[PDB]
Design an enzyme around this catalytic site. Structure first.
Site, PDB file in Angstrom:
ATOM      1  N   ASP A 149       1.111  -0.899   0.135  1.00 12.00           N
ATOM      2  CA  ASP A 149       0.370  -0.003  -0.301  1.00 12.00           C
ATOM      3  C   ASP A 149       0.733   0.770  -0.725  1.00 12.00           C
ATOM      4  OD1 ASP A 149      -2.900   0.787   2.275  1.00 12.00           O
ATOM      5  OD2 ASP A 149      -1.712   2.645   0.190  1.00 12.00           O
ATOM      6  N   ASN A 151      -0.052   4.341  -0.378  1.00 12.74           N
ATOM      7  CA  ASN A 151      -0.950   5.730  -0.260  1.00 12.74           C
ATOM      8  C   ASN A 151      -0.981   6.772  -1.154  1.00 12.74           C
ATOM      9  OD1 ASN A 151      -2.654   4.586   1.947  1.00 12.74           O
ATOM     10  ND2 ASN A 151      -0.473   4.466   3.822  1.00 12.74           N
TER      11      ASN A 151
HETATM   12 MN   LIG Z   1      -3.571   2.977   3.279  1.00  5.67          MN
END
Ligand SMILES: [Mn+2]
Ligand SMILES: [Mn+2]
Length: 257
Positions: A149, A151
């Site tokens: 992840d 982000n």
């Molecule tokens: Mn996240």
């Protein structure tokens, strides 16, 4: 062929309460990387930490019930590294680097920056330390796979609302610019090797029917180094799979040893 799945699970017990073990059994990946475990092994039911046919490795944060990443693999890695050797990044349960023999596997849970200006500085430096670490390793001769992840949605195609989020952490010029530079260092976002369509996301907000409305972001990636990209056969998104605000993402690579 090796099948690898990455998944931000939004808490391992949370997802287990929603058919995790059933899904895992039907998918039968060779390696399962998880982000945002939110638990230490000793707080986990024994059937979540010992799954038949798989070896588990857990990297919890200093803080309990916060972040942390896990790895399940049929065949165990020769060793795991749980940091970059910079302690303000190494203590949050964000880094698992598993040395299999044909490649390194980075299982990374990159920080969220939305929290504050402090956490933004933190996320961006985490990005730098990460770049430094991965580059040292492949210049030394290692083939690398990076999943997890990030982000950050790379490009306008990688989210539903680019315009609205141009000043929100996740789609800021600095953050997307880092991914450009990452890719300039000799790395390929594998999904875009095989798929150039829009509306392809891996996260949606739990609120206001965002998943049903496909208002989402592509926050989860599989990267390979350039000199390894010939060995990837498939990079796809498991968007039917429920149980988290992220869906899982898949990779298949060919090699012997
Ligand atoms: Mn996240
Ligand atoms: Mn979450």
């Amino acid at each position: 062929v090796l099948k690898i799945i990455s998944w931000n699970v939004n808490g391992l017990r949370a997802v287990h309460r929603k058919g995790f073990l059933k899904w895992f059994m039907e998918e039968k990946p060779d390696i399962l990387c998880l982000q945002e475990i939110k638990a230490a092994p000793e707080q986990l039911p024994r059937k979540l930490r010992h799954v038949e046919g798989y070896r588990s490795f857990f990297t919890p944060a200093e803080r309990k019930g916060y972040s942390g990443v896990a790895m399940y693999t049929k065949v165990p890695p020769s060793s795991l590294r749980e940091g970059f050797g910079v302690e303000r990044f190494d203590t949050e349960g964000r880094i698992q680097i598993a040395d299999f023999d044909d490649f390194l596997l980075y299982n990374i849970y990159f920080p969220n920056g939305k929290m504050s200006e402090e956490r933004l500085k933190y996320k961006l430096e985490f990005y730098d330390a990460f770049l430094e670490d991965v580059n040292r390793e492949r210049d030394s001769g290692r083939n690398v796979i990076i999943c997890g992840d990030f982000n950050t949605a790379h490009r306008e195609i990688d989210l539903a609302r680019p315009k609205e989020n141009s000043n929100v952490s996740g789609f800021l010029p600095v953050e997307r610019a880092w991914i450009d530079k990452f890719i300039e260092n000799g790395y390929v976002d594998t999904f875009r090797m095989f798929n150039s369509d829009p509306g392809q996301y891996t996260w949606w907000s739990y609120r206001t029917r965002a998943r049903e409305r496909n208002v989402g972001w592509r926050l989860d990636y599989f990267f390979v180094n350039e000199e390894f990209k010939g060995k990837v056969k498939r990079s796809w998104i498991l968007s039917d799979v429920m149980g988290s605000d992220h869906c899982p993402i898949g990779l298949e690579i060919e090699l012997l040893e």
